[PDB]
Amino acid sequence: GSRKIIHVDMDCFFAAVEMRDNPALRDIPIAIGGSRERRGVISTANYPARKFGVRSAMPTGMALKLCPHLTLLPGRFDAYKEASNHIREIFSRYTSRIEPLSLDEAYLDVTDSVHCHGSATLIAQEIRQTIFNELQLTASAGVAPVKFLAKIASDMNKPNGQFVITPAEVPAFLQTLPLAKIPGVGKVSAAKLEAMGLRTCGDVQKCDLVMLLKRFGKFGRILWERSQGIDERDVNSERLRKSVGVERTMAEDIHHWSECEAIIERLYPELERRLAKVKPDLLIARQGVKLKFDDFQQTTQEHVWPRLNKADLIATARKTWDERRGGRGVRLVGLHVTLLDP
DNA sequence: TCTGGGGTCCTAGGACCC
DNA sequence: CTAGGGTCCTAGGACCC
Numbered sequence: 198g199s200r201k202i203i204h205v206d207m208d209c210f211f212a213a214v215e216m217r218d219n220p221a222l223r224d225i226p227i228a229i230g231g232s233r234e235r236r237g238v239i240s241t242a243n244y245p246a247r248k249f250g251v252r253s254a255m256p257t258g259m260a261l262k263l264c265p266h267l268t269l270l271p272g273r274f275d276a277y278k279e280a281s282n283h284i285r286e287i288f289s290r291y292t293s294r295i296e297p298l299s300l301d302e303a304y305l306d307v308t309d310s311v312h313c314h315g316s317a318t319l320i321a322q323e324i325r326q327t328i329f330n331e332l333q334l335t336a337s338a339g340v341a342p343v344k345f346l347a348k349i350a351s352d353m354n355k356p357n358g359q360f361v362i363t364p365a366e367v368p369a370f371l372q373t374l375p376l377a378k379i380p381g382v383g384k385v386s387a388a389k390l391e392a393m394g395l396r397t398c399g400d401v402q403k404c405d406l407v408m409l410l411k412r413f414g415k416f417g418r419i420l421w422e423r424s425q426g427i428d429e430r431d432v433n434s435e436r437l438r439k440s441v442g443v444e445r446t447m448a449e450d451i452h453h454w455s456e457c458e459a460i461i462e463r464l465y466p467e468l469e470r471r472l473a474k475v476k477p478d479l480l481i482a483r484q485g486v487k488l489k490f491d492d493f494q495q496t497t498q499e500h501v502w503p504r505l506n507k508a509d510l511i512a513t514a515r516k517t518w519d520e521r522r523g524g525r526g527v528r529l530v531g532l533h534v535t536l537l538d539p
Numbered sequence: 540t541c542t543g544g545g546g547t548c549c550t551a552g553g554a555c556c557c
Numbered sequence: 558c559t560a561g562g563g564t565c566c567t568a569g570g571a572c573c574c
């Protein structure tokens with residue numbers, strides 16, 4: 198039969214949090230990101246800032262050119278994590294089939310429920326209302342027979358709204374639905390599709406799957422599927438974090454290896470703590486290092502390793518710095534571990 | 540404007556053992 | 558009648574939040 202998926206997405210998450218915890222903001226253009234001297238980027242802006250065209254992933258200086266009297270906050274992640282924990286707890290009250298995607302997003306599966314007589318509409322409605330009650334903070338939601346359509350639905354009545362797609366409304370919805378709205382279809386893909394001539398799902402509904410498979414491979418057949426309205430993916434409930442990293446971007450490029458080693462030594466204790474929380478004994482399936490150069494090119498050097506240790510990371514780093522650097526300076530130094538299957 | 544810090548999933552391409 | 562060609566790694570892209 199038809200499944201019942203709800204996707205929930207907080208509104209302007211970080212900015213919403215700083216707004217609630219300080220309404221002295223609330224009406225000024227603010228953004229969470231790094232400082233311009235520290236070569237930072239906008240993590241998120243509120244609507245008064247977006248008004249000036251300030252977006253997430255935008256370099257901070259650019260956001261400042263668009264909004265000089267922007268109020269930039271560094272971030273308070275433990276609070277965001279508190280809110281995430283909270284809304285997840287709320288999600289549980291209605292179902293066990295919950296797949297978190299981030300601090301502020303999740304998929305919920307509710308096709309087997311008595312909570313609103315089967316009304317995904319009313320359960321979503323509730324969830325949002327109690328998020329506003331308990332957390333004093335808004336939320337938007339989408340409802341659909343499949344994941345990606347619930348994702349797309351949760352945007353369509355944003356902010357503090359919800360939207361519901363029924364199996365009856367799907368082909369109508371799909372005929373004029375732009376490809377760039379489907380998750381996983383970013384600007385590169387959305388360009389290749391333009392050259393190919395594809396803009397709506399309805400355009401893909403009438404092409405040749407052999408072609409998409411030849412020019413896109415996987416996440417090419419997916420497009421054909423989603424355009425036909427198929428997404429047989431399921432809420433995972435026990436999806437676990439496969440990797441953990443810690444990386445730092447410096448205010449000035451470094452050109453001395455001593456600087457690099459020093460930075461690795463400042464970063465490792467932080468890779469320690471975070472690892473000592475999924476595996477307090479220090480797992481490792483693989484470990485590795487990351488260098489970003491002045492020309493904004495990066496390289497990662499990882500390998501199979503038994504257990505987390507600094508010496509191997511510094512060896513690998515001294516080697517990555519002597520073999521891939523090419524006289525360049527480095528803006529970013531990073532540490533990284535992959536984790537085991539169980 | 541001069542571009543973060545976390546992560547996900549795919550793929551090419553090399554290297555090694557058979 | 559000095560394997561080649563298949564596996565399994567690593568590096569990197571694209572995308573997500």
Ligand SMILES: Nc1ccn([C@H]2C[C@H](O)[C@@H](COP(=O)(O)NP(=O)(O)OP(=O)(O)O)O2)c(=O)n1
Nearest residue numbers: 206207208209210211212240241253254301574
């Ligand atoms: N590039 C990005 C995008 C998201 N994030 C963080 C900041 C956001 O508050 C949070 C939520 O992701 P998001 O839903 O895409 N953005 P946000 O909730 O602020 O906007 P809306 O969902 O209301 O449109 O992730 C980030 O740090 N870097």
Ligand SMILES: [Mg+2]
Nearest residue numbers: 206301302574
């Ligand atoms: Mg989001």
Ligand SMILES: [Mg+2]
Nearest residue numbers: 206207208209
């Ligand atoms: Mg959001």
